[PDB]
Every structure is written in C-alpha cells, then in structure tokens.
Amino acid sequence: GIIEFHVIGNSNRRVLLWLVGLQNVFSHQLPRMPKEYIARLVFDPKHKTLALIKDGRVIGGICFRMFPTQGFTEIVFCAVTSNEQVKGYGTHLMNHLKEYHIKHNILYFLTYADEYAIGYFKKQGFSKDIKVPKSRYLGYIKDYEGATLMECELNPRIPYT
Amino acid sequence: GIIEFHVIGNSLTNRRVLLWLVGLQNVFSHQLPRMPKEYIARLVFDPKHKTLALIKDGRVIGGICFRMFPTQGFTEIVFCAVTSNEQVKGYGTHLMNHLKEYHIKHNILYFLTYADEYAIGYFKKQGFSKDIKVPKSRYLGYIKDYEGATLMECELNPRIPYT
Amino acid sequence: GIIEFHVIGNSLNRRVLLWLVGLQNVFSHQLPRMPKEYIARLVFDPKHKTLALIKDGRVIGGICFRMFPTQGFTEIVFCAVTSNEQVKGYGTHLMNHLKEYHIKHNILYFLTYADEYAIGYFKKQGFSKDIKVPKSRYLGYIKDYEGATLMECELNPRIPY
Amino acid sequence: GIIEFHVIGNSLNRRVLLWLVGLQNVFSHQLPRMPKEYIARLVFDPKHKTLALIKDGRVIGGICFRMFPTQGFTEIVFCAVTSNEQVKGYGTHLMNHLKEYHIKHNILYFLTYADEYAIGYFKKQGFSKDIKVPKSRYLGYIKDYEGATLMECELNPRIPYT
Amino acid sequence: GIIEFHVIGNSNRRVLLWLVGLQNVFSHQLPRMPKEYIARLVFDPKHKTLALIKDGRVIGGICFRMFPTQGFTEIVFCAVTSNEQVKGYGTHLMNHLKEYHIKHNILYFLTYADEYAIGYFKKQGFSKDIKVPKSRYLGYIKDYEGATLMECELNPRIPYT
Amino acid sequence: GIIEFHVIGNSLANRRVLLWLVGLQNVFSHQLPRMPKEYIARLVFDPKHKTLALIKDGRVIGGICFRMFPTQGFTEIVFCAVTSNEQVKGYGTHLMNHLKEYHIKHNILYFLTYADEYAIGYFKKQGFSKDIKVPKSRYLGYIKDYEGATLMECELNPRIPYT
Amino acid sequence: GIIEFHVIGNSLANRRVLLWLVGLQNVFSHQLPRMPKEYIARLVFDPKHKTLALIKDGRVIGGICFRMFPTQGFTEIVFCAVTSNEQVKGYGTHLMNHLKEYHIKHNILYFLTYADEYAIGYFKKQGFSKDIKVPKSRYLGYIKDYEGATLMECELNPRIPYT
Amino acid sequence: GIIEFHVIGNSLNRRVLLWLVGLQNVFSHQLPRMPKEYIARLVFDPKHKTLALIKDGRVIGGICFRMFPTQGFTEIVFCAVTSNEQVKGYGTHLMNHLKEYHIKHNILYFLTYADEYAIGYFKKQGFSKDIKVPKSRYLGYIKDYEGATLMECELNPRIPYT
Ligand SMILES: CC(C)(COP(=O)(O)OP(=O)(O)OC[C@H]1O[C@@H](n2cnc3c(N)ncnc32)[C@H](O)[C@@H]1OP(=O)(O)O)[C@@H](O)C(=O)NCCC(=O)NCCSC(=O)CCCC(=O)O
Ligand SMILES: CC(C)(COP(=O)(O)OP(=O)(O)OC[C@H]1O[C@@H](n2cnc3c(N)ncnc32)[C@H](O)[C@@H]1OP(=O)(O)O)[C@@H](O)C(=O)NCCC(=O)NCCSC(=O)CCCC(=O)O
Ligand SMILES: CC(C)(COP(=O)(O)OP(=O)(O)OC[C@H]1O[C@@H](n2cnc3c(N)ncnc32)[C@H](O)[C@@H]1OP(=O)(O)O)[C@@H](O)C(=O)NCCC(=O)NCCSC(=O)CCCC(=O)O
Ligand SMILES: CC(C)(COP(=O)(O)OP(=O)(O)OC[C@H]1O[C@@H](n2cnc3c(N)ncnc32)[C@H](O)[C@@H]1OP(=O)(O)O)[C@@H](O)C(=O)NCCC(=O)NCCSC(=O)CCCC(=O)O
Ligand SMILES: CC(C)(COP(=O)(O)OP(=O)(O)OC[C@H]1O[C@@H](n2cnc3c(N)ncnc32)[C@H](O)[C@@H]1OP(=O)(O)O)[C@@H](O)C(=O)NCCC(=O)NCCSC(=O)CCCC(=O)O
Ligand SMILES: CC(C)(COP(=O)(O)OP(=O)(O)OC[C@H]1O[C@@H](n2cnc3c(N)ncnc32)[C@H](O)[C@@H]1OP(=O)(O)O)[C@@H](O)C(=O)NCCC(=O)NCCSC(=O)CCCC(=O)O
Ligand SMILES: CC(C)(COP(=O)(O)OP(=O)(O)OC[C@H]1O[C@@H](n2cnc3c(N)ncnc32)[C@H](O)[C@@H]1OP(=O)(O)O)[C@@H](O)C(=O)NCCC(=O)NCCSC(=O)CCCC(=O)O
Ligand SMILES: CC(C)(COP(=O)(O)OP(=O)(O)OC[C@H]1O[C@@H](n2cnc3c(N)ncnc32)[C@H](O)[C@@H]1OP(=O)(O)O)[C@@H](O)C(=O)NCCC(=O)NCCSC(=O)CCCC(=O)O
Question: Which catalytic residues are annotated (chains A, E)?
Fold first, then answer.
C-alpha cells in the first residue's frame, strides 16, 4: 500500500501504537535483549525512531540516539519484520536515516553490529575503521562487548533520498 | 523486619524524606569518620545529589549517596555505608544492585568512585575494577578528586537484571 | 559606497533575512560545484554564523563559519567575495575582521579545508598545513573532506584597548 | 576598622554600584598596563562576579572571577589590594574567602594567568603551573594572556578556608 | 520522484529553505533580473509563490501577487530548473495557479513578457489584447519598458487540475 | 401557502439557514443545468455572496443569489431560479422586486447580470437593458464574465418603493 | 439669535443631535415637497450621510445634506434647504461656504450634485459649473442620475479661506 | 556636520513637533506666495508625511508628500531646502531617499504640479510632463492649480537610489 517513513518518538494515539508496533518488531527480531529494555529505550524522550509503515502498520524501523554534542549518532535497534526482509527495505530505511541526519548536520553513525548483521552494515557503507576518538563515544554508545563496533561517514552533498 | 529502598534527594521544589536524609548524614558521618560531618551534609542535601536509602522499619540503616553526570555518561559514587550492627548481612550488596538497576533505567552504565584501602575490597566484590575505561578528560573536575585513593570503575550491563 | 561588516545568522528581521539570501547567492555562485541546497541549509542553520561584508546595503562577500568553544577552534565553512569586487583586499579584511571577532570570543584556532583553487588565499591569510589542533578535538566536528587539504590558523591573543 | 567581604556583581543598588566602581578603580590602578575599559566591561559583565573587600565602608581590594560550572572551574580574572593595604594578609584572606565560597558551589579548580609581578603571590596561595584540568575544558572559555604562566589551584572541600 | 505543489510565502524552516530554493531557480533561469530584486519580492509578504517540489526539492515555481481590490493577479516570475524543462512542468504549474485563482474569485492574470517568454504565455492561454483597463493595472503591477503586457482570463466553471 | 422572503448567506449559520442554502443550491442547479453544480455550490456558500430566498411552507421554491460590490457601486446577479412547478405565477418578479427594494435601502443602485439567449426577456421584463451605462472599467473582472452571454444592466430609483 | 453650524449625522444618537436631524428631515421635505418624506428621512439618518445644520436660536433653519465619497475624491450635495422665513438672507451661501471650508480641511476638492431646474441658479452663485472635470468613471453609479436633472460640479481650492 | 533623514508627520514626541514646525517655516519661507496657514495645515495633516533633512539638529529642508496607496501614486506637495544650503546636492539626496522609501512601500509613481521655478529641479530628478497615470486616477486627489505643470516620475524598483 502507501509506504511511508516517519521519525517518531515520545515527547497522540497513532504514534503510540506505532511505538508499541516498533517495540514488538525490535523484541521479536532482536530476541537477545529483554523486552523491558527495548521498551524503555524506544519510549525514551532522547531516543527517536524512524518508522517504516506499510498501510498503517509498522513493519520496520531504526531506533537511534543523536549526540550532536558529540558529533555522531548511535544506532540502537534495526529490524525489519520477517515477511518484509530482503526486499531492500532496510536499505531505504538507512537512506532516510542518512538523509535525516545530513538535514540535521550530523555526519557519523556509530553502531555495535552482531556477527549476523555485519554484512548488512557493510552494504550500508559502514566500516570497521573507527575514525572517532574512543574518548568521544565511550560511555555514550551503549557498549556491547563482543559485538563489533562500526562507523559510517555521511557526505552532506549527496542526496541520500 | 520490613525493608524498603528509596532514591531520595534534597528538592528545591516533605518531612519523611528530610528526616531520612538526616539519618543518612548520621550514618555516613559515623561510618566514615575521616569525612567531616559538615562536608557530608553539604553533599547529601545538595540538589544534584541523589541518595538511595536503605530503610528497615522506617529507620535508615544504610545507603549510597551518588551524583549523576548524564552529559558526561557516568555516576559518581559519593558515600555509602551500612550502620554498624547491620553490616555483614548482605545489605551492602543489595544497595549496590538496586543502585545498578536505577542506573540502567536512566541509560547510564558507568560508575566512578575513589576508594581508600579499606573500601577497595568491597568495590571489587561489587565488580568494580582499578582499570578505568572512561577518559580522564571526561571525569576530571566533575568528580570530587581524592589524591591518595584508588579510582575504581564499574561497567553495567543493560541486558541484565540486577534486582 | 560605505563598507559595513556584520556577523549575522538565523536566530531560531527582514534586513538580516535578505542578507542571508544575499550570502547564499555569492556563496553558491563563487563555489559552483557545491549544492545550492547545502549552502542554503548551512547559511540558515542557527548554530552557524556568517560575517557579511556589506557595501551599499548589498552583499558583496562574507565568511560562513561555525564556532566550537567546547573544542577551542572555529570551523570555516564558506568564503567568497563576489566577482566584480575580488582582488581588492576585501577577502583579507573579512578574514581580519573574523580574527578580531574570535580573539574577543577567546577562540584562537581556525580549521578549514582548502581545495587547490583556494589554498593560496589561505596561506596568505596565515594558514598552514601544520595542524597543531589534536585530531582528538576536531574529528566529527569539522566536515571531513577527502581530497581537500586541512589547513590551520592560530590566532594571537590580544588584550583589547 | 570593620572589615567585610561580599560577592558582588552586575546582574539584571547604589551601594553595590559604587562598590563595583571602586573595584574597577582599585583593579585598574594596581594593574596599570591593563586598559581601564577592558577592566570595566569585565567588572560590570553579568557573568563576572567580584569578591569585594570593604574596610570601614570602602573598597580596598577584590578578586574578580568568572565561574564556569558546566566546565568545573573558575577563571580568576583580577586580584588587587590598594597599595597602602598591601603586605598585611589582605590578599591571602581575599583568596581564602574565594576558596570557601567555591567549596560551597562545588567548583574545585581555579585557573588563572600569572605575569612576573604576581606569580609569587599565586604560588603562596597554592597555585601550581601543573594544570590537572583538560586543555579541552578551558581552551575556548578563558582569555589567554600569552606570555603569562597559566596556573591552576585545586581546592579541598573537606577543609575550612574561612 | 514524488512531485507536489504548494502555495507558500513569507509571513518554519523548510518553507524558508523552499523560498531560497525558489529565489535560486528564478535568478538562474532569469539572468537579466537582479538577484536581490528577485529575493526582495519572493520574501515580500504580499507576494505568494507556487512551489513545484520534486522529491523534496524545489525545481520550479510561479511568483505571483494577488490584487483582489483590482480584480486580477500579477504573474511575477516563472521558472523550471534547467534539467526539468520541457516535461510539462511549466504547464502544470500554470494550471494549478489557475485553479487556486478560481477558488479565490480572481479570473484575470496580467504579466509582462519579453520575447523569449511570449511563446510560453501564449501556450498557457495568454493574449496580447488586454481587456483590463490601464486605469486598473497601471501603477499596481510593475511595468517593464519594452516587455509585452500579456493577459489571461480564467473560467471558474472549469477544472484546471 | 405562506410565502416569505429572507436575505441569507453563509455567515463566516444555523440549521434552518444551512438547509435553505442547500435547497437553493439544489434549485439553482436544476433550473440551470449548464451550470456546474460544484460551481453553484461554491458560490452560494461563499461568504461574500448573499441570496434572496423565496420560502413557502418552510420550503425553498426560488431565489436570487447576488454579490454586492459596494466599493464599485453595483450588485452582480449570480443565479435566478424559481422551481418548475411555481413558475409563471409571478414569483420571479416579486423576487426581483424584493431584491430591488433591498438595494435602494442599501444605497446600491445598479444591477449587472449576464443573460444567455434564453433568459433575456425575463430581465427585460424586470427593467434590465442591454445598454450599459456603467463603465467597463467599473465592473470588468469583478463580475463573472460569460463570453457569448449578453451583459444586462438595471438602474434602480431610490425615490420609488419596489415592494 | 445665536447662529451655529454643526456637521452632524446618525453614527453607529445624541438626543440634541437626533432632534436636529428630524428638524432637518422636516425642512428638507417641506422645502422639497415633491420627494417622498421617506426617501428624505432614510438619507438624513443614513450613516454614510452627514448633514451641516444651520442652528438659529437653537431651532434648525436649514442645512446641506451630503455624502463624502473619499475613495473617489468627491462629496455629493444631496439636499439643500433654508426655512422659508429665512431665505434670501445669505444663509444658503454661508451654509455652502462652511461646507466648502470643511471639505478643504478633509482634503476633498470636488463637489458633485444633480440639480433640478429650480436649484441651478443657486448652485451657479455658489460657483458651480455644468462643465464636469471629474471623469464619468468616478461618480457614475455612486450618485444617482435622475432623469431631467443637471449634474453640476464645484472645484475647491485649498489655499482659500472660505469661512 | 551630522546629516540625517527622517520620515515624520503628525499621527493624530516634542523633538518631532519642533521638527515639523521647522519644516513649516522652511517651506513657508522658500514658498512665500503660498498662505502659511495652508502650508501648516498640510504639514501637520495626518494623511501627509514629510521627509526631513536634519543637519546639526536643525531642519534644513524636506519633502512633504502624500501617499495614495489605493490610487498607486504619491503626491509631491512641497520641496524646499534652506536658502544657505542649496546647490550642494541636498535636494537631490532628499528625493533619492524619497525614491527608496517608495520602492520599499511599493508605490512607484510620483505626481506633482510644478511651478515654473521648480520645473528644472524635478527634471534633474527625472520628472517629465508625459503623464502615464490616467486622469481618472489622480484627478481631484491632487489639486490642479491653474498655471501649474503636472509632472510625473516613474521609479525603477530594481535600481538602488540610496
Ligand atoms: C538486517 C535487517 C535489519 C535488514 O533487513 P532487509 O530489509 O532484508 O535489508 P535489505 O535492504 O532488504 O538487504 C540489504 C542487503 O544487505 C545484505 N545483507 C548482508 N547481511 C544481511 C543480513 N544479515 N540481513 C539482511 N541483509 C543482509 C543482503 O545481501 C542485502 O541485499 P544485497 O546484497 O545488497 O543485494 C533485517 O534483515 C533484520 O531485521 N534482521 C534481524 C535483526 C538484526 O539482526 N539487526 C541487526 C542488529 S541491530 C543493531 O543496531 C545492534 C543490536 C545489538 C547487537 O547486535 O549487538
Ligand atoms: C562497605 C559496607 C557499606 C558494606 O557493608 P555490608 O552490608 O556488610 O556488605 P555485604 O554485602 O554484607 O558484604 C559484602 C562482601 O564484601 C566482602 N568485603 C570485602 N571487603 C569489604 C569491605 N571493605 N567492606 C565490606 N565488605 C567487604 C565481605 O566479606 C562481604 O561478604 P562476601 O565476600 O560476599 O562473602 C560496610 O562494610 C560499611 O559500612 N563500610 C564502611 C563505609 C565505607 O567505607 N564505605 C565505602 C567508602 S564510601 C565511598 O564511596 C568512598 C569515599 C571516598 C574515599 O573514601 O576516599
Ligand atoms: C578567495 C576569495 C574569497 C578571496 O577574495 P579576494 O577579495 O580577492 O581576496 P584579496 O584580499 O583581495 O586577495 C588577497 C591575496 O590573495 C591572493 N590569493 C591567492 N590565491 C588566491 C585565490 N585562489 N583567490 C583569490 N585570491 C588569492 C591574491 O594574490 C592576493 O594577493 P596579495 O596579498 O594582494 O598580494 C575570493 O577570491 C573568492 O570568492 N574566490 C572564489 C571562491 C573560492 O574559491 N573561495 C575560497 C574557497 S571557500 C573555502 O575553502 C572554505 C571551506 C570550503 C570547503 O570546506 O570546501
Ligand atoms: C598580589 C596582591 C593582589 C596581593 O595583595 P597583598 O595584600 O599584598 O597579599 P598578602 O596576603 O598581604 O601577601 C601574601 C604573600 O604574598 C607574597 N608575595 C610574593 N610575591 C608577591 C606579589 N607579587 N604580590 C604580592 N604578594 C606577593 C608576600 O611576600 C607575602 O608572603 P608571605 O605570606 O609573608 O609568605 C597585591 O600585591 C597587589 O594588589 N598587587 C598589584 C596587582 C596584582 O599584581 N594583581 C595580581 C596580578 S593578576 C590579575 O589580577 C590580572 C589578570 C592576569 C593578567 O594580567 O594576565
Ligand atoms: C517558461 C518555463 C518556466 C516553462 O518551461 P517548461 O517547464 O518547459 O514548460 P512545458 O510545459 O514543459 O513546455 C511548454 C510548451 O510551451 C512551448 N514553449 C514556448 N516557449 C517556451 C519556452 N521559452 N520555454 C519552454 N517552453 C516553451 C514549448 O513548445 C513547450 O512544449 P510543448 O508545446 O508542450 O511541446 C521555462 O521555459 C523556463 O524556466 N524558462 C526560464 C524563465 C522564463 O522563461 N520565465 C518566463 C517569463 S518570467 C515572468 O513571468 C515575467 C518577468 C518579467 C519580464 O520578463 O519582463
Ligand atoms: C426566469 C425565472 C427565474 C422567473 O420565472 P417566474 O417565476 O415564472 O417569473 P414571473 O414573475 O411569473 O414572470 C413570467 C413573465 O416573464 C415572461 N418572460 C419573458 N422571457 C422569459 C424567460 N426567458 N423566462 C421566463 N419568463 C420570461 C413571461 O412571458 C411572463 O410574462 P408576464 O410578465 O407574466 O406578463 C424562471 O422562469 C426560471 O426558473 N427560469 C430558469 C432559470 C433561468 O433562466 N434564470 C434566469 C437566468 S439565471 C442568471 O442570473 C444568469 C447567470 C449567468 C448566465 O445566464 O450566463
Ligand atoms: C436654495 C436655497 C437653499 C437658498 O436659499 P437662501 O438661504 O436664501 O440662500 P441665499 O444665500 O440668501 O441666496 C444667495 C443667492 O442665490 C440666488 N439664487 C439664484 N437662484 C436661486 C434659486 N433657484 N433659489 C434660491 N436662490 C437662488 C439668489 O438670487 C441670491 O442672490 P443673488 O441672485 O446671487 O444676488 C433656498 O432657496 C431653499 O431652501 N429653497 C428650497 C429648496 C431648494 O430648492 N434648494 C436647492 C437645492 S435642490 C436639492 O437639494 C435637490 C436636488 C437633487 C435632485 O433631486 O436631483
Ligand atoms: C529646488 C530645491 C528644493 C533643490 O534643492 P537643492 O539642494 O538646491 O538642489 P541640488 O540638489 O543642489 O540640485 C541642483 C541642480 O539642479 C539644477 N537645477 C535646475 N533648475 C533648478 C532649480 N530651479 N532649482 C534648483 N536646482 C536646479 C541645477 O543646475 C543643479 O545642477 P546639478 O544637477 O547639480 O549639476 C531648492 O532650490 C529650493 O529649496 N528652492 C526653493 C523652493 C522651491 O522652489 N522648491 C521647489 C518647488 S516645489 C513646490 O511646492 C512648487 C509649487 C508646487 C505647487 O503648485 O503645489
């Protein structure tokens, strides 16, 4: 149906049910993390979420945490619901997220990828060469140990969307 | 007895809480004799200081005074004590665990603190470590420094329940 | 006509408004390979300021910059003097005002990237390739460009009056 | 006669206003190479406060400072004692008061610059050329007087200074 | 490419950037017009502008000024950006402007056209025979020595879009 | 059988008037079928158009939708219709008269209308004329132009009672 | 008797003004007895119409009803009358002289009127002309063109003391 | 000395009032065969504006005008500068300022009835006898003094006059 992207968060029913929608999709695709954890982070004020909507219904999104005081943006949760993967949705999601960030003058993503995920983060432009001083992000980015930290650098000249 | 925990603090915007804070200043000062009593009470009743209080039968029997630095990304452990006839019962670790839970819920996962010789052992068993991942450039001037004490650090795991 | 220097920006005034569009035009005209949209987005960003050089109510040049007190330097984003008034010292006065403005604001370091068409002008303004600012302090704060040369300028602090 | 301290500033009283002028006077006289008006814009800046030393009604000394609590330190801007009150301990009591004041606001580091003529006083007040504080924490905030040693003082909140 | 139309003006950031986008497209497509004149009118509040928005960015517009008291509108600027011309965009912009002017009780367009623009206005149902009296438009619309005054009369009983 | 006149219009209205406006838009739309019913609708509910409604047993049977241009010194006649089973009874004249008297009481003295081939003798019999004394500069681009229709004019005497 | 001039009308009255207006409604209709009293009354009390009243000994003895059309730059003389026991004494010429002075001070420099056969003499003596300098497009429709009545104009000079 | 321009008038502030009276003097004195009553009644009329030329406090000239925004033009009513400051560009700088003022208020036509001594000046200011504004549009809104020359000036809104 109509496909739409909304950057939504907690500061309205339509947004609220979308946020439960997202928390359902993040808990279900990322089972290794307590659903109570995903709920707090999704419904936190400082966290925003880019929501992919197919016909009223959440099917995917990205939860992030902008650190404009730090120069970068932390990518917290990335899921696309199982009957919607591998149709290039995750890419469209990352690009809207990229476009959103260049419009807000922020040019580095930082995220902790799991072994299963790294291939998709490559294909979005993320590298293992972390050019940000560890002193800049340690303690702000939620430091999963074992998970693999990656960087992305945006070019505010390219239209990502 | 009945046991309750409570994050309390001197608000600039109540009386149970007041007498509760007084009781903590009395515990901290008497269990921490080389801390001047006036210095403790200044910190406790300071607004940007919170204080997890441990209450047994309405009576303060311990607690941790801490100062959050969310902009910096870590919490300063300021005081903690358990009153003398309630130590070695596990109350000290229950305070720490609860303190750890509150701090996941507030998206902070780093504890800094200075320890004398006599407290260093306790903090290791709360899973602090001498190795400090946090940049000096981030905590210096915000945490009450202590020349002559160890700087300990603790890293919390948001995927874990502590209480 | 009489020359005026003003440090302006979007405040988050009709005369300042049309001046910011004037700057957006001489910036986007003299830096022709840069997206008009991008220059406009930055000129009108509230956290960027622009030293405008005014001659007869009309914009003839200026320097778009972005200060980083928390980091001790200022990023210089755009510098252009309009064509019919270049090589008249106008560029130098703009740079010299900027230096005066920053000494008074206790920032004594400029960081800029210089393409080959512009690097000489910056050398002649007291810039060097010798970046004394720790890389620790500027990554993720200055728009890292590849293929361009990062230049530094260190100001000399002055006791006013 | 009566000696008396007050932390004065220009916010948004005739007594306080003339007190400030006296402070600009004493500062500008004891710092003769400082432009008088640069001293003026500072004393009367809202973000600057001054610890005034009044003696029998009259400004004889002071320490002008700017607090940077979001950065954990205070910048010491001007110290001075009028010349016929120097070498009496007035300078030290002015400092010790400024310390006691800052313990109470949980700022525990002083930064300042020291020319030839006053570094010895600052060392007697416990300032060191070792700067514990991150250069990343003050480089864009404090006025640099290049040619004058930057010095730091770290405060112990557990001790009385008054 | 999601195209979309909007009648906007100066009384919101994206609207501001949208007008800058418009002032740009106008200057570049109408070079003999001073850039500052174009901006002075676009950001004048009695002047509205029908922005054509391809995939988020301005790629065309008509700056017009409505004169209800006088019973007509002034067509002030017309442009479609260079890469998007001869696709129909110019005619679609006129038709939307015509519908807006039906639903607003205004059924007369006046414009001055130089020789290169006369072809386009004839195609949009403009004519050189001006039935509005000089008494009604003169000194209200900005006249142009040597440009043809072109007139258009709309049918409120027609759908134009 | 009780017949009333009311000058109504869309105030920028209660249900009786709203329903009347609709009934007027219904009637105008049927007795004028070459007029887009969406155009009739948009005009009748315009806040600067008024309508002299002929009502019988609470029911709209006819009206004259007009547009007063007091700055220009005349009124435009927009729509004129009596329902079909009430025509040729003299309703359309009483409507014109009530409208004529309405306007001299409002110090407007000129009517302008466009009349197709099939409406011209109606207006002739209500005092309208093809000879326009109003200057083209006064009305052009203020009245809705209908190319191929005859512009008609009417001059009202304020020393006359019309009703 | 003490004579007075007062520009009055029905605003949006004062019981001394309101009785003056009927005093005028009387004098106008009685001196112009072939115009319906109703038409005179409606106008005198129309609020876009003012009246310059001539008050002798408190009673009304004449006046000039007028209508200022500033947007068009002219005023219309609509009624002029002096009580019968007070004609041929200079009253109609003072009333006009005041009307003139008043309009200079309001930056209006043209008077128009449609004079009947019996008025024309008076208007000429007040410097009125049949030669109309104001284009037809400015007054037509705004002032009523009675068949058989003579448009006459008066052009005022602001550098002249009229009163 | 210091020279400033000020569009002033009576709003229906004493330094303004004394400034208007200064204008009514200067006008009345440069235009002696015009009744001073009439000059004054205009200058202080509220539908009238006056662009004042202040040199060292003192009003040395100005232009009294009347904007007819509904009719699309502005009447020039009085132009004078003091007898001992003419022929220095003052009256031309005054009109240039009046031109810019009217561009921003989108009124791009001036009309004036000139006496024979004025005509040269308005022509240097770019006035001409070829009136594009239809009679219907200005007639009666401006008094047509017999013997006076109706002149017109069209302003170009893309040119910078000041
Ligand atoms: C990976 C996504 C989010 C993307 O879904 P998508 O729409 O299918 O992506 P697409 O545009 O259609 O395809 C893009 C392209 O990415 C490549 N790719 C390589 N590895 C993978 C992979 N594991 N999954 C999905 N795609 C992957 C595929 O080949 C795709 O096609 P392509 O090769 O480009 O032609 C989705 O498949 C999903 O929800 N997976 C399960 C959740 C997950 O594992 N998320 C990653 C971790 S989230 C985070 O920020 C960290 C949490 C903490 C931690 O991990 O430690
Ligand atoms: C440390 C506490 C508060 C803990 O009391 P508790 O309820 O009895 O603890 P528990 O859970 O029952 O047992 C914990 C376990 O920790 C072990 N342990 C090893 N070393 C120590 C040690 N030094 N102190 C307390 N326990 C210690 C004990 O064997 C306990 O049993 P376990 O090993 O688990 O079988 C208590 O002993 C006390 O009141 N101590 C004196 C107050 C004190 O020194 N607190 C820490 C310093 S305050 C601060 O934040 C630092 C200020 C800056 C500076 O000091 O320089
Ligand atoms: C470069 C400026 C802004 C300076 O204009 P100006 O008024 O002529 O300066 P001036 O005081 O009269 O001349 C002083 C001196 O500058 C020297 N110079 C050396 N190289 C150049 C050069 N490439 N362009 C202009 N001047 C240059 C001239 O020889 C002059 O020599 P002199 O000292 O008089 O003997 C102007 O020419 C201009 O707008 N040029 C075209 C646009 C441009 O390339 N601007 C500089 C790039 S913007 C930038 O690098 C900021 C960051 C951009 C990014 O991040 O990518
Ligand atoms: C330095 C002060 C302010 C101190 O006043 P005081 O009453 O004499 O202090 P005290 O407690 O009685 O004496 C304590 C001790 O200070 C020692 N000392 C060593 N060197 C100096 C020195 N250069 N000046 C003053 N005292 C100095 C004296 O020997 C005393 O020693 P002691 O206590 O007996 O062991 C005074 O001498 C004075 O007013 N001097 C003139 C102004 C001045 O030098 N101010 C400090 C310059 S920094 C400033 O405020 C400007 C900004 C920085 C910049 O310009 O870059
Ligand atoms: C005129 C427009 C805006 C329209 O372009 P467009 O998107 O290509 O329109 P289209 O529907 O795709 O094609 C329309 C059709 O109109 C015909 N035509 C005749 N002359 C022209 C012409 N000069 N340019 C474009 N088309 C023109 C062409 O045959 C076009 O294709 P078609 O007939 O459908 O096969 C465009 O060409 C353009 O951007 N031109 C540059 C600026 C400009 O020419 N503006 C018009 C005058 S600005 C004004 O309103 C008055 C300012 C005062 C003054 O000039 O003095
Ligand atoms: C014309 C009216 C509205 C009036 O009808 P009514 O109630 O019967 O009036 P009445 O007092 O009994 O007068 C009947 C009298 O009018 C005469 N007559 C001469 N020509 C016509 C004519 N063309 N149509 C209707 N009647 C006409 C008849 O011979 C009758 O003779 P009579 O006066 O009784 O001796 C009615 O017949 C009707 O419903 N007509 C259908 C709609 C219509 O044509 N309305 C007039 C035009 S709408 C407009 O305002 C113009 C919009 C723009 C445009 O037209 O382009
Ligand atoms: C006209 C007036 C108002 C003037 O009477 P007044 O107070 O005596 O004025 P005055 O200063 O003493 O006379 C100055 C001079 O006016 C001359 N005059 C020349 N023709 C006439 C004339 N036809 N009627 C009255 N006076 C006339 C008299 O001869 C006087 O002496 P003069 O000949 O100059 O040596 C008076 O006669 C009167 O009230 N008459 C009855 C009403 C009347 O006819 N008023 C004239 C206005 S007509 C009107 O308002 C409706 C026309 C609108 C329309 O329906 O189209
Ligand atoms: C005309 C002005 C106002 C001009 O002020 P200014 O500073 O002297 O003029 P400027 O800037 O130096 O420009 C001088 C230049 O204008 C040329 N010019 C040609 N004819 C004349 C002329 N008749 N008067 C003044 N200048 C005249 C002179 O050759 C000068 O040559 P230039 O252009 O400098 O090379 C001045 O001379 C003056 O105050 N004159 C006395 C009052 C006067 O005549 N005012 C203008 C009449 S406006 C009016 O109300 C007339 C009656 C209108 C009505 O019927 O309501």
Answer: 74
